[PDB]
């Protein structure tokens, strides 16, 4: 019952969830004459709530915020975003008018700042090498090597054996590595590796687009990304 894009109309946004006080958040966005579909993901932390990535756009990250409130009625008080895309960070300034502390990498931050996206007010520190892990609330941020960008980050939620890939990780049904613009296709495959050394007890993949698996969605990533390099 995960939501898909002709399930989700542009500007509304779906919670689904994962595990007890992990859930995904959803949405859909017009892009280069196309809707797509996005992931990011909620984490509860005692009281409050740690977003990673907003809902792609000024708009679906203020709805994002009303159906948290709704549904779960915890405030969220910080967000990191995984890279430095509009899927990542639009809607970044939303959020820190509400009150929530948003961060993201020194390189997310210069990179968002010259591509003239939004920018986070913090930056996290200890994520500059690939295999770096930190602490932040209750996850564990990954930094697995250049993938899709070289900024990528991933997040894994210890209590539940979740592990959010963003667009480091592809779903299942994919064919191919989507928008390599900004990717490193030679990196990339390693980098997955990285990610399956670190996390082999994880239960549960959530791609940055469509639909979560199980561990498959890592190996499948290096496969896809390493036929469409050829
Ligand atoms: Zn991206
Ligand atoms: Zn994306």
Same mark, same amino acid.
């Given at each position: 019952?995960?939501?898909?894009?002709?399930?989700?109309?542009?500007?509304?946004?779906?919670?689904?969830?994962?595990?007890?006080?992990?859930?995904? %958040?959803?949405?859909?966005?017009?892009?280069?004459?196309?809707?797509?579909?996005?992931?990011?993901?909620?984490?509860?932390?005692?009281?409050?709530?740690?977003?990673?990535?907003?809902?792609?756009?000024?708009?679906?990250?203020?709805?994002?915020?009303?159906?948290?409130?709704?549904?779960?009625?915890?405030?969220?008080?910080?967000?990191?975003?995984? %890279?430095?895309?509009?899927?990542?960070?639009?809607?970044?300034?939303?959020?820190?008018?509400?009150?929530?502390?948003?961060?993201?990498?020194?390189?997310?931050?210069?990179?968002?700042?010259?591509?003239?996206?939004?920018?986070?007010?913090?930056?996290?520190?200890?994520?500059?090498?690939?295999?770096?892990?930190?602490?932040?609330?209750?996850?564990?941020?990954?930094?697995?090597?250049?993938?899709?960008?070289?900024?990528?980050?991933?997040?894994?939620?210890?209590?539940?054996?979740?592990?959010?890939?963003?667009?480091?990780?592809?779903?299942?049904?994919?064919?191919?590595?989507?928008?390599?613009?900004?990717?490193?296709?030679?990196?990339?495959?390693?980098?997955?590796?990285?990610?399956?050394?670190?996390?082999?007890?994880?239960?549960?993949?959530?791609?940055? %687009?469509?639909?979560?698996?199980?561990?498959?969605?890592?190996?499948?990533?290096?496969?896809?990304?390493?036929? %469409?390099?050829?």
């Amino acid at each position: 019952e995960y939501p898909t894009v002709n399930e989700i109309p542009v500007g509304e946004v779906r919670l689904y969830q994962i595990a007890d006080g992990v859930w995904s %958040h959803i949405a859909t966005q017009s892009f280069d004459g196309a809707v797509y579909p996005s992931n990011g993901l909620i984490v509860r932390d005692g009281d409050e709530l740690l977003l990673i990535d907003t809902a792609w756009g000024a708009k679906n990250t203020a709805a994002l915020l009303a159906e948290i409130e709704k549904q779960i009625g915890l405030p969220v008080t910080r967000a990191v975003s995984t %890279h430095f895309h509009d899927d990542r960070v639009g809607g970044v300034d939303v959020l820190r008018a509400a009150g929530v502390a948003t961060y993201a990498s020194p390189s997310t931050r210069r990179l968002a700042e010259a591509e003239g996206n939004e920018i986070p007010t913090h930056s996290l520190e200890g994520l500059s090498s690939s295999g770096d892990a930190v602490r932040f609330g209750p996850v564990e941020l990954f930094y697995p090597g250049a993938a899709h960008s070289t900024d990528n980050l991933v997040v894994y939620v210890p209590s539940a054996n979740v592990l959010y890939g963003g667009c480091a990780v592809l779903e299942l049904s994919s064919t191919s590595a989507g928008n390599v613009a900004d990717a490193d296709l030679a990196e990339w495959p390693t980098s997955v590796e990285r990610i399956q050394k670190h996390y082999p007890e994880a239960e549960v993949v959530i791609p940055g %687009h469509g639909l979560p698996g199980g561990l498959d969605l890592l190996q499948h990533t290096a496969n896809v990304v390493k036929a %469409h390099k050829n």
